[PDB]
Each structure stands twice: as structure tokens, then as C-alpha cells.
Amino acid sequence: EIAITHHVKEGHEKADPSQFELLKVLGQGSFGKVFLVKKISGSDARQLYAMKVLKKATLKVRDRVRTKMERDILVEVNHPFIVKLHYAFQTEGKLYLILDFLRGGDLFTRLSKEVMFTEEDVKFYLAELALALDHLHSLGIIYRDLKPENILLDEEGHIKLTDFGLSKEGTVEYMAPEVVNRRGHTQSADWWSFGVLMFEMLTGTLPFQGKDRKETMTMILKAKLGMPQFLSPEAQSLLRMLFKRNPANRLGAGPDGVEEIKRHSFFSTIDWNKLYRREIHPPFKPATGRPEDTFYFDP
Numbered sequence: 001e002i003a004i005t006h007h008v009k010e011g012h013e014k015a016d017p018s019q020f021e022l023l024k025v026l027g028q029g030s031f032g033k034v035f036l037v038k039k040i041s042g043s044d045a046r047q048l049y050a051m052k053v054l055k056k057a058t059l060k061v062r063d064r065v066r067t068k069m070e071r072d073i074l075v076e077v078n079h080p081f082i083v084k085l086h087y088a089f090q091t092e093g094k095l096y097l098i099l100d101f102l103r104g105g106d107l108f109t110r111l112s113k114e115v116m117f118t119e120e121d122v123k124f125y126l127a128e129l130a131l132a133l134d135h136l137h138s139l140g141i142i143y144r145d146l147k148p149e150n151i152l153l154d155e156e157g158h159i160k161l162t163d164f165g166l167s168k169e170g171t172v173e174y175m176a177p178e179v180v181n182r183r184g185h186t187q188s189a190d191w192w193s194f195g196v197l198m199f200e201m202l203t204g205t206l207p208f209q210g211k212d213r214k215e216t217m218t219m220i221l222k223a224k225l226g227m228p229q230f231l232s233p234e235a236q237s238l239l240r241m242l243f244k245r246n247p248a249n250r251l252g253a254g255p256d257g258v259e260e261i262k263r264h265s266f267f268s269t270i271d272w273n274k275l276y277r278r279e280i281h282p283p284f285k286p287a288t289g290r291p292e293d294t295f296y297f298d299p
């Protein structure tokens with residue numbers, strides 16, 4: 001309901017600490033700290049959100065100005081398969097970002113537990129991801145580190161790409177040959193990482209992995225991809241089209257971008273309009289902390 005209203009306006013709203021109730025810390029990492037918070041007043045009163053807290057000392061100083069790019073990169077990001085920045089505010093030493101709260105964990109947790117995903121699951125996750133990447137692309141934003149940990153699941157099983165790897169147009173194993181050649185991260189490199197993620201979900205392994213950085217680097221540049229034979233011809237075709245060393249030949253890098261991906265035989269069963277509208281039932285429904293799916297019953 002609040003989503004339709006945010007679709008007509010750009011950016012986050014103003015807020016302050018008094019409008020949030022803190023429940024718990026969801027996590028801590030090199031990024032900062034994430035809290036589970038509840039909105040107290042206004043139209044979204046009682047709504048749960050994830051509050052990410054950043055220390056200002058970590059923030060980049062450019063032309064004598066301490067920048068807040070973690071807040072500003074999200075100004076125009078507004079898609080169903082990407083986290084939305086709802087509010088942002090500062091204290092003397094911190095930057096606070098209020099984002100969506102996702103209950104179903106991340107794709108890293110699911111992949112580690114299940115080892116590998118079926119082509120059905122991969123087709124679903126990748127289709128939703130292609131729409132998210134295409135949304136960022138139309139904004140001149142690319143994704144550095146498109147790994148399973150950066151994709152969250154909601155209680156229904158729909159994806160939400162996190163804002164962690166967002167950057168204006170990192171793990172070496174996910175880097176495209178042109179990025180290894182220090183040519184800069186373009187939308188075409190995103191499609192290479194899309195293929196690396198595709199390979200990892202389907203195999204539980206990384207396509208180019210060496211004994212040290214040099215070998216991984218040289219393998220990304222020169223190694224022929226080892227094609228797994230348990231994969232369908234459509235899946236194999238998508239992988240060889242995404243793993244083209246020359247970015248100009250890579251699927252999704254053509255004149256019609258994402259349309260090349262959507263048109264691919266691997267996604268022939270995907271109704272892109274129903275997928276966008278979340279009318280496609282996710283093939284996996286994750287476990288949540290919610291009592292309905294944790295309590296045992298003897299009716």
C-alpha cells in the first residue's frame with residue numbers, strides 16, 4: 001500500500017531516532033550494523049524495517065565534503081526485486097539507513113544448506129535478478145560483487161537484491177575479464193557476474209578458481225569454461241553466451257540489453273509481466289522466525 005505512493009515520488013523521507021523502536025541487532029559486518037526496527041508514527045506506523053548504521057569516519061571525503069553515497073546511490077532505486085531506502089538521517093557520528101526487512105534469509109544460506117539449486121529455481125531467481133540489474137542499469141548503476149549473500153529472500157520466496165554492492169557505472173572470482181584488465185565495471189560486467197552466480201547456484205562451485213589471485217585472474221582471462229554435462233542445452237547455451245570474454249559479444253551487452261536475456265531459450269517458460277507483478281509463485285518458500293512456521297502442532 002505504501003509502495004504505490006513511493007512509486008510516484010523519488011528518494012527517502014526525512015526521519016529522526018524518536019520515530020523508531022529498536023527490537024534487536026540482526027547483524028554486524030565490515031559494512032556496519034543492522035537493527036530490526038519498528039516505525040512508531042505516520043502512514044506506515046508499526047511497520048518493521050531493517051536499520052543499517054554506518055560510522056561517518058568510514059565515509060569518503062571528496063572536495064573537503066564527507067560524502068554519503070550509501071544514502072544517495074539509492075535515490076532513484078525503486079523496483080520490487082531490490083531493497084528500498086525508506087528513510088535516512090544522521091547523528092553527529094552516524095548515518096542511519098532504513099530499508100526493507102526480509103525474513104527469509106539470503107541465497108548464500110539456502111545454497112550452503114542445499115548444495116545446489118535445480119534449473120527451475122535458478123530460472124526463477126535469475127529472471128527476477130535480470131529485472132533488478134536492468135533497473136539499476138537504466139540509472140547508470142552497476143553491481144560490484146553480485147554474490148548469493150547479496151540476494152535476500154522475503155517470506156513468500158521472492159528475491160530482494162541488497163544495496164551493499166551498488167556503485168555508479170571485491171571478490172576476484174566474480175570479476176569479468178575486462179574488470180581483471182582494469183577496464184572498469186560496466187553493465188556488461190554485471191552480466192558476466194550474473195553468469196558466475198548462475199554457475200554457482202547450479203553446481204555449488206565457482207567457474208574460475210585458482211591456487212592464488214594470479215591463477216584465478218589468468219583463468220578468468222584465458223581458461224575455457226568447464227561445462228557441466230548434467231545441465232540442459234538451454235542452461236549451457238546461457239552460460240556460454242554470458243561467459244564471452246569480449247564484453248561486446250556477451251548476452252545482455254547488445255543494443256537491446258536485458259531483452260537479449262529475456263528472449264533466451266533458458267527463460268522461455270517465464271511470463272515477464274506476471275514475474276514483475278509477483279504473480280509467479282516462487283518454487284521455494286523459506287523458513288522464517290514467525291511462530292506459524294516454528295511451532296509444532298497436534299490438532
Ligand SMILES: Oc1ccc(-c2c[nH]nc2-c2ccc(O)cc2)cc1
Nearest residue numbers: 026027034050052099100101102162
Ligand atoms: O547481516 C544481515 C544482512 C541483511 C539483513 C537484512 C534483513 N532484512 N533486510 C536486511 C538488510 C540490511 C541492510 C541492508 O543494507 C539491506 C537489507 C540482516 C542481517
